[PDB]
């Protein structure tokens, strides 16, 4: 888990091979690509309360808001089972309205 110790990217596994006076590693790594743009917001105001995402991030494609994992674009609709509530939303700077 320590960054850049073995492999540029996210490490997956490795293989050792011998060499006349040393060793050779073949670091297998995962690297993301083909990025895109979206519009974000740190919380969601519903009935005054401020829902936050359990794991992921809020995004929007112009009309609809989605919650996705942070390393691969995969949008899921927003439901009360992947968000948790904390107080009411007037002290948070960046709230947006939604359902």
């Amino acid at each position: 888990k320590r960054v850049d110790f073995c492999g540029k990217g996210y490490h997956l596994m490795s293989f050792p091979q011998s060499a006349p006076h040393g060793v050779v590693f073949l670091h297998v790594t995962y690297v993301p690509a083909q990025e895109k743009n979206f519009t974000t917001a740190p919380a969601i105001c519903h009935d005054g309360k401020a829902h936050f995402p359990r794991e992921g991030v809020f995004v929007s494609n112009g009309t609809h808001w989605f919650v996705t994992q942070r390393n691969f674009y995969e949008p899921q609709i927003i439901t009360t089972d992947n968000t948790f509530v904390s107080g009411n939303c007037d002290v948070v700077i960046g709230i947006v309205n939604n359902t």
Binding site: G22, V23, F25, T29, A33, A41, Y73
Partner: protein
């Protein structure tokens, strides 16, 4: 002979309500070579000197 260029200069399109999420991946295999040993050597005084 010329002056070194540290790399291509780009400006990341920072804002305060915009993010970028990857949509595809690749898997890369890269090598790395490390010595672990050196040849063992012994020397006899009387023979050499």
């Amino acid at each position: 002979a010329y002056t070194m260029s540290l790399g291509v200069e780009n400006s990341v399109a920072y804002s305060n309500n915009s993010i970028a999420i990857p949509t595809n991946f690749t898997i890369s295999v890269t090598t790395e070579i490390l010595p672990v040993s050196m040849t063992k050597t012994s020397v006899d005084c009387t023979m050499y000197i």
